[PDB]
A paper describes a structure:
Polymerase δ‐interacting protein 2 (POLDIP2, PDIP38) is a multifaceted, “moonlighting” protein, involved in binding protein partners from many different cellular processes, including mitochondrial metabolism and DNA replication and repair. 4 This is followed by two predicted globular YccV and ApaG/DUF525 domains, with putative functions in bacterial homologues of hemi‐methylated DNA binding (YccV) 5 and nucleotide binding (ApaG). 7 , 8 POLDIP2 stimulates Polδ by increasing its binding to PCNA, a homotrimeric ring‐shaped processivity factor for DNA synthesis, 7 potentially by bridging the molecules, with the POLDIP2 NTD required for full stimulation. 9 POLDIP2 directly stimulates PrimPol DNA binding, synthesis and processivity during translesion bypass.
Here we report the crystal structure of the POLDIP251‐368 fragment to 2.8 Å, demonstrating that it has a rigid core structure with closely packed extended YccV and DUF525 domains, confirmed by solution scattering and molecular dynamics simulations. The POLDIP251‐368 structure was solved with molecular replacement, using bacterial HspQ (YccV) 14 and human FBxo3 (DUF525), 15 with one molecule in the asymmetric unit and R work/R free factors of 0.216/0.288 respectively, 99.67% completeness and 99.6% of residues in preferred or allowed Ramachandran regions. The POLDIP251‐368 crystal structure exhibits a globular fold, with the YccV‐like and DUF525 domains juxtaposed on top of each other. The YccV‐like α1 helix leads immediately into a presumed “linker” region between the YccV and DUF525 domains, comprising the α2/310 helix (residues 201–230). Instead, we propose this region is part of an extended YccV (E‐YccV) domain. The E‐YccV domain is connected by a short linker (Ser231‐Asp232) to the DUF525 domain (residues 233–368), which exhibits a fibronectin type III/immunoglobulin (β‐sandwich) fold, comprising two opposing four‐stranded antiparallel β‐sheets. Part of the N‐terminal loop was structured in the crystal (residues 49–66), comprising the short β0 strand formed partly from Met50 (remaining following tag cleavage). β0 hydrogen bonds with the distal β15 strand of the upper β‐sheet, thereby connecting DUF525 to the N‐terminal region. On closer examination we observed an internal cavity traversing the protein at the interface (dashed boxes), lined with predominantly hydrophilic residues contributed from both E‐YccV and DUF525 domains (inset). During structural refinement we observed that Cys266 exhibited electron density that could not be accounted for, either by alternative rotamers or by surrounding residues (green). Protein mass spectrometry also confirmed the expected molecular weight, furthermore, a mass difference reflecting the size of the density was not observed (not shown). This prompted us to speculate that this could reflect an oxidized (or other) post‐crystallization modification of Cys266, given its exposure to the cellular environment via the channel.
Numbering used by the authors: 49 to 56, 65 to 108, 126 to 144, 168 to 253, 258 to 358
Write the structure that this text describes.
Amino acid sequence: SMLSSRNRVGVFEVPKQNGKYETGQLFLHSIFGYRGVVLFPWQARLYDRDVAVKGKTHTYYQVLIDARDCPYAIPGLDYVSHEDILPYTSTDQVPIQHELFERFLLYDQTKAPPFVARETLRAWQEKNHPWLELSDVHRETTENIRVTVIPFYMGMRSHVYWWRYCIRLENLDSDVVQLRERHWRIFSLSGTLETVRGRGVVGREPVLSKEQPAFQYSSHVSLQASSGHMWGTFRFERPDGSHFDVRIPPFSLESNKD
Ligand code: NA
């Protein structure tokens, strides 16, 4: 979970233009303004319906969120785009507060960023990197509400399959809105078609103003099949009494590659 509200160390770098970020890069989320550290780069196909879907390779990052700006599925663990990263420099030998931080990074003033992969991390990257080939990135805009979805395959355990999903919601306008209802359609490979219509997202009814323009949450979906496609609508309410359905662009839930 995270809304956008306020921030508060370091020196600010220039966002990179023709280069990927390095393991150990400290950054603030350019939207949620948390303190984070880069773990490794990851190339995802991005299906952005707002070029008007011939998906283009785009550099994403697995990342550790500082536990002071927060409370497979590890708590401080998150994915951010290249654009999400405002890079910066500290000289704290502990710049990010998180249980995984020391396990993954050795401090060492030799190099920049000044934190190196503990080989605990290289094993982790090698373990995770395959499964992430199952994570495409979907984004579509309706009525100045931009939706981003990434599915992540959790594993399996009759035979049941688990995905988590990041959804981000962004008000691009100044007009105030609030998420009120979700209406999921989940269509399995079995030909089962589940549906879900309810108040809010994970307990929340987020208000999106240019004072708090963005919300990101994580939830999970279960099938009794190797694969399926999922899509739906969020219903938003305006102060003027009106309401509109923001499309969640279709994404896919996968287990095998070929
Ligand atoms: Na370097």
